[PDB]
Write an enzyme that holds these catalytic residues in place. Structure first.
Site, PDB file in Angstrom:
ATOM      1  N   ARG A 160      51.499  40.798  35.826  1.00  0.00           N
ATOM      2  CA  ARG A 160      52.182  39.772  36.653  1.00  0.00           C
ATOM      3  C   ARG A 160      51.648  38.375  36.431  1.00  0.00           C
ATOM      4  O   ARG A 160      50.463  38.199  36.256  1.00  0.00           O
ATOM      5  CB  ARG A 160      51.998  40.111  38.157  1.00  0.00           C
ATOM      6  CG  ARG A 160      52.976  39.347  39.048  1.00  0.00           C
ATOM      7  CD  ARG A 160      53.004  39.934  40.467  1.00  0.00           C
ATOM      8  NE  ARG A 160      51.800  39.526  41.166  1.00  0.00           N
ATOM      9  CZ  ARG A 160      51.684  39.619  42.486  1.00  0.00           C
ATOM     10  NH1 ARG A 160      52.705  40.104  43.220  1.00  0.00           N
ATOM     11  NH2 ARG A 160      50.572  39.201  43.068  1.00  0.00           N
ATOM     12  N   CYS A 197      52.373  34.507  38.556  1.00  0.00           N
ATOM     13  CA  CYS A 197      53.087  33.921  39.691  1.00  0.00           C
ATOM     14  C   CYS A 197      52.750  32.441  39.748  1.00  0.00           C
ATOM     15  O   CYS A 197      51.647  32.030  39.352  1.00  0.00           O
ATOM     16  CB  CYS A 197      52.578  34.528  41.000  1.00  0.00           C
ATOM     17  SG  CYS A 197      52.685  36.349  41.056  1.00  0.00           S
TER      18      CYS A 197
END
Lengths: 132, 140, 136
Positions: free
Chosen positions: A110, A112
């Site tokens: 991930r 972000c």
């Protein structure tokens, strides 16, 4: 099975996720990998955002991503890497809770960040790469 | 379950998606993994300048955090069976575009002569108050 | 069609260096090819012919970015039609409509997957940056 003279790039078009009207597709499959567009929290049924809150949009984003992945022959459990874009870093915690619930035990790679702004004034956008 | 010395260790020890978990890089506690290997490629999370040894940022400055980010990336890549020399593409996110020059110097020093494809931009804000975040894809 | 040219001429990673797109003068390459996929850097609207931005406007820079991407892709042995995914970054979200018209024109009937957002800022004060992944 083949249906006459299958191609290198396959367009994914789920009738349940927001319609890709314009110069893009919901996802493209290439060499066994599924490259998914950044979903925003639109509800295909109304054509509008599922609501004005990060909670409602985040739930719709994660649902839309599931629809696209399943249409492609993939799934949430086959997601390799996501990128999660927020309109406001203050909304990251509520997003994280919803994101974690959508993926259950599966934990993709991930990245972000908070963008200065997202298309259509969206509060959240999530894209991903998955496998078949 | 996992492979040891590049060999399977029972059904379950090897799978299409492999979770990368370096005890040297920040622990992935929440709903993500440091990196995922799929079909011979390593998809790395955006590292931020946390020091696994302290659970906290390596320092308050762009120089200290950029160095830690690059080091963390190296730990994750090498844990996966990859390396900095095998990095294909990075994305470099900053909290302040004016930090581009100092960041670039540290990034270049970490990669030596290797030159991944790259995209860079300044975000409005990064997770956990980070000044800098770098994600990448690499090959085994 | 292409052939090897001695040990070391071909490797797992290939650097893409089009002389028609802006020269990569920093610690990066225009694109890297790996396992039959081309991973392209974020292009900004610099014109190789001048060494400066194509113009001050979103229109001029967007057209130049799309052209630069096409040059990198064709150097690599790929093409606009073989683009799988793009990420499109803007200095100002209000530029989305004008950028999108230029992006669609460049891709014609081909529709890659896409993510778009506005950044707080881009390198060199660029108004627009586009990166992509494509196949050979």
């Amino acid at each position: 099975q083949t249906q006459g003279p299958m191609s290198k790039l396959t367009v994914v078009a789920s009738p349940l996720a927001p319609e890709a009207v314009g110069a893009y597709s919901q996802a493209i499959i290439c060499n066994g990998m599924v490259y998914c567009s950044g979903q925003i929290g639109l509800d295909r049924k109304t054509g509008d955002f599922a609501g004005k809150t990060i909670e409602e949009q985040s739930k719709q984003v994660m649902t839309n991503l599931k629809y696209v992945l399943e249409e492609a022959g993939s799934s949430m459990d086959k997601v390799v890497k996501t990128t999660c874009l927020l309109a406001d870093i203050k909304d990251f915690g509520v997003f994280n809770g919803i994101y974690a619930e959508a993926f259950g035990n599966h934990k993709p790679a991930r990245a972000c960040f908070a963008a200065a702004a997202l298309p259509k004034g969206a509060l959240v956008e999530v894209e991903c790469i998955a496998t078949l």
